[PDB]
Amino acid sequence: STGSATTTPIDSLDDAYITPVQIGTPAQTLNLDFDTGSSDLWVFSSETTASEVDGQTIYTPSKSTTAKLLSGATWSISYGDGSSSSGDVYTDTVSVGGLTVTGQAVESAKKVSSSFTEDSTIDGLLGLAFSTLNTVSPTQQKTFFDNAKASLDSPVFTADLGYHAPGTYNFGFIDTTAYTGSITYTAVSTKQGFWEWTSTGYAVGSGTFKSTSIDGIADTGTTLLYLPATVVSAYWAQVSGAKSSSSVGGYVFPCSATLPSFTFGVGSARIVIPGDYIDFGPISTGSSSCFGGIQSSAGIGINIFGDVALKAAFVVFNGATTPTLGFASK
Numbered sequence: 001s002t003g004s005a006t007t008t009p010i011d012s013l014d015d016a017y018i019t020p021v022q023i024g025t026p027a028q029t030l031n032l033d034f035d036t037g038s039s040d041l042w043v044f045s046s047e048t049t050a051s052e053v054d055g056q057t058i059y060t061p062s063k064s065t066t067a068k069l070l071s072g073a074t075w076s077i078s079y080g081d082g083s084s085s086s087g088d089v090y091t092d093t094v095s096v097g098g099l100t101v102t103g104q105a106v107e108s109a110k111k112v113s114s115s116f117t118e119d120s121t122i123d124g125l126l127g128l129a130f131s132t133l134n135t136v137s138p139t140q141q142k143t144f145f146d147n148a149k150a151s152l153d154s155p156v157f158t159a160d161l162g163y164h165a166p167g168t169y170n171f172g173f174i175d176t177t178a179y180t181g182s183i184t185y186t187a188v189s190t191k192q193g194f195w196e197w198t199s200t201g202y203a204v205g206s207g208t209f210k211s212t213s214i215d216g217i218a219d220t221g222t223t224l225l226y227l228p229a230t231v232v233s234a235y236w237a238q239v240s241g242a243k244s245s246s247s248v249g250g251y252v253f254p255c256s257a258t259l260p261s262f263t264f265g266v267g268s269a270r271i272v273i274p275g276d277y278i279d280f281g282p283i284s285t286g287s288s289s290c291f292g293g294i295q296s297s298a299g300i301g302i303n304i305f306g307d308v309a310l311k312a313a314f315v316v317f318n319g320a321t322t323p324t325l326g327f328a329s330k
């Protein structure tokens with residue numbers, strides 16, 4: 001089997017992407033944030049604290065003839081932006097772009113943090129990291145991908161995120177019309193539960209490539225590109241007037257600037273992030289100070305190849321027995 005779904009930026013900045021997901025019988029369609037940085041499928045629901053819901057579409061398991069409460073099971077998660085949620089668990093039928101999993105753990109939120117409430121466009125998360133990170137207790141649950149894996153034509157999914165435009169998530173096949181050149185594959189460590197790999201280096205604009213090992217994760221649930229401070233400093237030094245602002249909480253730059261590109265290495269291959277992809281707009285409405293899309297990972301404890309990096313590529317998440325990651329230009 002296969003599936004294919006369009007993923008759509010939630011706003012003009014591409015702060016995140018949403019993908020429609022069918023849950024239950026008859027289908028209830030919710031727009032979820034596909035997150036290769038986490039391993040829980042969770043939704044706003046009829047169980048969510050009333051005051052914590054503001055515009056989201058909710059899953060109502062009582063209206064689904066295939067929902068079953070997973071007895072005694074609970075879940076609780078936190079993300080890198082400091083947001084969190086928690087609740088109980090149902091099993092139900094979940095379909096993504098024509099690919100159906102029966103018996104999928106659907107984590108029903110009872111509680112969500114303010115950032116989730118405040119974003120009306122995201123109806124929950126669909127985690128695509130390794131199931132070892134799944135938070136359900138006392139019986140850990142598998143991800144959608146893990147459950148669909150053996151049924152897929154090939155045990156893979158691909159992320160093709162657009163810049164200020166819709167993209168695609170495919171399951172079980174690689175669309176060879178969706179990228180240019182070849183896909184370069186690279187080793188993955190699953191020891192922290194993430195799609196963790198090692199970039200071979202970087203370049204700033206038309207500058208010389210610096211060969212250096214940069215360990216980090218491929219994370220569709222993180223908007224920006226978080227890299228070591230040395231790297232980030234080298235980038236922003238090429239932007240007149242750019243500065244790290246402790247008050248704003250990262251590098252800012254004059255909105256009048258034209259930003260240089262940023263290149264990252266994948267083995268001997270190179271992925272080029274255009275300058276405009278690194279512009280995240282005014283720090284506040286009407287401001288002429290803009291927020292940068294490359295930021296320091298100092299203090300995170302891990303480097304993160306977020307949407308700013310992944311959207312410049314066609315990315316293969318190869319869930320073979322030994323997982324790997326593939327990157328192609330497009």
Ligand SMILES: O=C(Cc1cn2ccccc2n1)Nc1ccccc1
Nearest residue numbers: 035037038079080081219221222302
């Ligand atoms: O936390 C993540 C993945 C992530 C961040 N998110 C923010 C909002 C909504 C979804 C979401 N997913 N990645 C990460 C961050 C820090 C350290 C390790 C992994």
